[PDB]
Amino acid sequence: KPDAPCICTMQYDPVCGSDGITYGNACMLLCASARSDTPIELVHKGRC
Structure with a gap:
């Protein structure tokens, strides 16, 4: 997906x-x- 404004x-809802x-x-x-470094992948909807 393209860059999506945050x-x-x-x-x-700090999702890890x-x-x-x-x-x-x-x-x-x-x-x-969109502009981090690598395609992160949600894992836990919180502070890990």
């Missing part, structure tokens, strides 16, 4: 994605998978 909401990074939200993630 401004979905402010529902601070395969990489060891707690993304403020699955969308913030979209920012990660």
